[PDB]
Every structure is written in structure tokens, then in C-alpha cells.
Copies of this chain bind each other. A is one copy, B any other.
């Protein structure tokens, strides 16, 4: 009764749209057994390398677990817990005959619109594992971006430790995936794909991937991206202003030597004007210690008021540098040394950026870019599945009488997604690739 790619089945749930007794064969008709075997090689490679190196990093954190429950380590721990669980789920298709168990129905058709009764749990389990670890992973990524952003604002005793926020971090990171997963199962939109060897949301009805895949991931790129940009906004404000205020102090010092060793009134004059231009450039800046303060505060007032006195004292020294009162101008500029000390020296204070915090910023922008690729690949599949579906409907009709599949999913896009998803797990596992861990695995080698 049925012709390729349809298959004989007496289950009304397995039957194809309009057609009776026939349902779509389990092995993805849009891809050849060679394309499948190749894809399964890609998944096993990236999955295996992610799985054990995330396990290594997860083992490193559990070794030093007293010192690992200390921010931002505890974040990278959970980020790893998620990519490790996601790798397990993806690596389930490799167990002897497990892929057919996950992606196929009893009657040999594709496992679609799961959960269903009379069909097994193997599909929904691998979906929950992969999807729940994914959404928990991208929400732990948001936590990471927040922590990294929080490192800059807490540059003093404005200190509200992340140690207390831990209760809200574990609220969001486990309630959000739970609610989204429960919703997917309630509407039974877990579907199997043999090239993926995994069960996932809205494979078949691509419209369920908007709300459950593109909308959560889209949101984490918004909230995550906000905290990554606001942080580098502070990193570059601090690093540039300290460098600006330093270079203005240095030219001020340079000219004070040019004045001290001046053999004429013309040199003192141009050296004081250069000092005045450097004093205004320094006034038109925020000292790193006054970054978390308002651009009109009584503290920020003292900074810019000191440069008013310095410009004022420069202007008094310029009233003597125009004529032959060089000795009276150099002695005036010598009292400029004491003003520069009482109103600039204080603002050359380092405000040294912690190595752990700067490193967290490296990981945040790497986890971002990877999730950005995931979102792009998933988005691509969303906007083109209607086409792949109608090009498939035609293949079954053509073969219900030279038959081809005109449009089809891109396998480089699927491999680019899996790279940018597994590569993240490998990237976030390189957080423990430090000297301290080499010694952590040496202090446990004996003990």
C-alpha cells in the first residue's frame, strides 16, 4: 500500500498526513545512510572530546570542592555540569542499538509528537537530558555574565557578595528549564531525528522551536549580552582613564623638567601651556576610584576643583613666563609640584583588576559567541523548515505514482551548530587548565 519514503503501519498515530496505512520511515529520508554514518562520526568525535574533558574539569572542581564553591568557580562548575550532561544525552545514540530505540517507533516510523502512550521513554529521557542541560547551561551563562559585570561595580566596600545571590542563581537556573521542559512534554512535541540520534522539541512542527528554543536562547543573548557589554564598558573606562590620567601626569612632569632646565622664557611659556592643556584633559576624565560615583557628586567635585587650582597656578606662572621673569616663573612652577601632589597623585591609584575577573570576561565572550552561532543555526532551520517540509510532501506524492528532494537541511549548518555547542563545553572546561589544578591533582595523587 506504501511506497518509499512512506512505510506500511496500522497505527493511526504513525500514519502520514491524509494517507492511511502509511507512515514516514524512521531513517531520515532526506539523508543517505552515508550522510548519517558521517554525521554520527562528527557527533561521536565532538561528543567524546567534550564529554571527558568536561568530566575532567568537573572532577577538578569536585577535588577542590571547598574552594570551588567560591565565585566565579561555582559558575564554571555548573556550566561544566550542563555541557557534561548534554554530552551524555548526545552520546546515548552510540550505545549498541540505542539510536533506533531513541529516534524510531515500534512500527518502524519516525518517533514524532512524543510523549505518547504505547511508545517507550527512551525518546523523552534523551530530550529532557539534552534540553534541560541546554537551557540550564545558557541560564548559568547569564549568571556568569552577571558575576563578571558585578566584579567592576564592587570596586570597594559596596560589596554585596555573590555568595548570598547563590539562592537566586539556583532559582532561575533550575526553574526556567523545568518550566520550559514540562511545557514541551505537556504539548507532546518531542520528535526524533536519525541524523541527530537525539530526541528534541519541535523537530517536526518547527513552530514549537520558536517559543521553546529561539525565544529562551534569544533572551539569554539579550540579558547575557547586556552584562558582557556593560562590563567591558567599565573595563575599558577604567583602563583608558587610568592611562589618560597617567599620561597627563607624565607630560605635566615632562614640562616641569623642561621649565626647571629652561634656558629662556619662551621654553617656560610653551611648557606651561602644554601643562594647562594636559590639566584640562585630565579634568575631563573619571578616576577609576570615582567610577561607581555620580558625574556631579561632592567627591567628583574635589577632583575637578583640584585641576581648577592647578590651571589657576599655571595661569599665575604664565603671567611671569611671557617676560624676562624666568627665575620668578620657574620658582612659581616649582610650587606647581606641590599642587600636582595634593590634587593629582591621589587619582594615579592603580585600582588593579583581579586576574580571575578578567579571565571570566574571556570565557563570557566565548560562551556568548558560541550561543550566538547556536541561535543563528537554529534560526536558519526555523525559517527554512516549511520549504524542506513542502519539498518532502512532493517527494512522497511523486513517489506515489525522477523523484528527488529539491530543498533539504544544510549539513554544514548542523555541523557548525554542533561545533559551536560542543566547542563551548570544551572551551568552558579550559577554566581549570591552570598551575593550581596541576598541583590540585598532585596533592590528591598521594592523598
Chain A residues in contact with chain B, CB under 8 A? 153, 158, 160, 164, 167, 171-172, 175-176, 179-180, 182-184, 186-187, 189, 207-208, 210-212, 214-215, 218-219, 222-223, 226, 230, 382
Contact = CB atoms under 8 A, between A and B. Distances in A.
Contacts of A171: 222-223, 226
11 contacts: A167-B230, A171-B223, A179-B215, A182-B215, A183-B210, A183-B214, A183-B218, A184-B211, A187-B210, A189-B207, A211-B215
A385 to B, nearest CB: 11
Contact of A187 (B172, B211, B226): B211
A270 to B, nearest CB: 46
A133 to B, nearest CB: 18
A214 B179 CA distance: 9
A187 B172 CA distance: 26
A382 B160 CA distance: 43
Given A171-B226, A186-B382, A211-B212, 18 more contacts: A153-B164, A158-B160, A160-B160, A167-B230, A175-B219, A175-B223, A179-B222, A180-B211, A183-B210, A183-B211, A183-B214, A183-B215, A187-B207, A187-B210, A187-B211, A207-B208, A208-B211, A211-B211
Contacts of A207: 187, 189, 208
Contacts of A222: 171, 175, 179
- The majority secondary structure among interface residues of chain A is helix
A182 B218 CA distance: 11
Contacts of A187: 207, 210-211
B160 A215 contact: no
A179 B221 CA distance: 11
Nearest to A164: B153
Contacts of A183: 210-211, 214-215, 218
A146 to B, nearest CB: 8
A172 B223 contact: yes
A183 B172 CA distance: 21
Contacts of A219: 175-176, 179
A153 B211 CA distance: 36
A226 B168 CA distance: 9
